[PDB]
Amino acid sequence: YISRYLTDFEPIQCLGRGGFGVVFEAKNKVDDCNYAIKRIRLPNRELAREKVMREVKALAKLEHPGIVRYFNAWLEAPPKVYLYIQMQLCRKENLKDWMNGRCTIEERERSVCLHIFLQIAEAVEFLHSKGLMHRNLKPSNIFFTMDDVVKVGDFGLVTTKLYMSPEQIHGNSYSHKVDIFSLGLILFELLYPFSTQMERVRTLTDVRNLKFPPLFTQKYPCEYVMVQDMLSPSPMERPEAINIIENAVFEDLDFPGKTV
Numbered sequence: 001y002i003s004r005y006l007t008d009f010e011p012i013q014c015l016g017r018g019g020f021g022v023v024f025e026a027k028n029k030v031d032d033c034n035y036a037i038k039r040i041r042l043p044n045r046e047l048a049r050e051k052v053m054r055e056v057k058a059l060a061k062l063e064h065p066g067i068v069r070y071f072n073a074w075l076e077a078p079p080k081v082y083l084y085i086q087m088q089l090c091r092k093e094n095l096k097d098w099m100n101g102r103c104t105i106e107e108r109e110r111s112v113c114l115h116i117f118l119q120i121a122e123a124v125e126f127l128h129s130k131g132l133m134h135r136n137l138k139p140s141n142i143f144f145t146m147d148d149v150v151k152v153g154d155f156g157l158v159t160t161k162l163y164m165s166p167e168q169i170h171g172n173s174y175s176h177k178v179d180i181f182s183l184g185l186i187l188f189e190l191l192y193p194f195s196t197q198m199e200r201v202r203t204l205t206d207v208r209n210l211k212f213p214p215l216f217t218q219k220y221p222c223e224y225v226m227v228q229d230m231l232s233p234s235p236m237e238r239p240e241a242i243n244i245i246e247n248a249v250f251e252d253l254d255f256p257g258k259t260v
């Protein structure tokens with residue numbers, strides 16, 4: 001049996017694993033480029049398989065600066081069926097890692113944080129404009145290109161329900177507004193650095209319930225209002241992504257070192 005993956009690629013390293021998947025870095029022999037390659041073991045559940053095959057077809061249609069870049073997908077059935085998905089390789093340190101390496105207020109300058117958040121919100125607006133939604137938006141699903149461009153995807157590198165909408169936690173029906181709730185918590189977290197995991201969990205739990213640290217509300221009055229709105233218990237009361245992106249806080253963002 002000839003494996004397409006083993007024939008066409010030189011494996012470099014395992015990047016991680018999660019759910020049905022394992023992710024590798026591998027070099028394509030013909031084009032000489034390194035890619036991230038996710039190998040998904042197709043489940044023994046026909047409805048779960050139906051979803052997987054639908055999801056790959058959907059992702060293949062997507063093209064946006066803030067969405068992971070798609071190259072190829074194929075199936076292998078060695079004498080277990082595997083779905084391989086080949087994407088543009090992102091940096092090893094994701095947004096969660098990035099925030100954990102910037103634990104002081106000086107390392108979370110407002111304009112830098114808003115620049116990163118804007119890119120996330122723009123990726124979400126893109127999905128919503130296509131009648132799609134993310135459903136699992138969180139810092140561990142937000143990576144960077146080699147040039148620090150934000151990339152949103154479903155990475156599945158398991159190393160949480162903290163960013164999940166109340167309606168999803170309760171197993172109720174939902175709409176694209178679930179992504180707005182996630183965005184609210186991410187905006188807060190970008191602006192507010194933590195020194196411990198315990199502090200992070202305690203504070204984000206409070207913020208979910210619209211209880212904010214007083215020093216955040218004072219330093220960032222405009223963003224405080226935005227987060228409040230995005231975290232509305234009622235999905236109807238949360239703003240659309242387009243209205244978030246058009247907010248005055250995102251105008252003329254600049255910082256020393258920003259790409260010209």
Ligand SMILES: CNc1nc2ccc(-c3c(C)ccc(C(=O)c4c(-c5ccccc5)n(C)n(-c5ccccc5)c4=O)c3N)cc2s1
Pocket residue numbers: 015023036037038040051052053055056059062067068085086087088089090091092093143152153154155156157
């Ligand atoms: C350490 N560097 C890394 N760079 C990358 C770059 C890309 C990926 C990656 C790969 C290799 C494959 C797919 C994705 C991804 O974002 C996925 C996405 C996706 C893509 C774009 C936007 C939202 C989700 N989907 C839908 N699905 C999917 C497919 C079948 C079933 C369920 C989910 C995904 O796996 C994905 N993020 C993983 C890594 S790890």
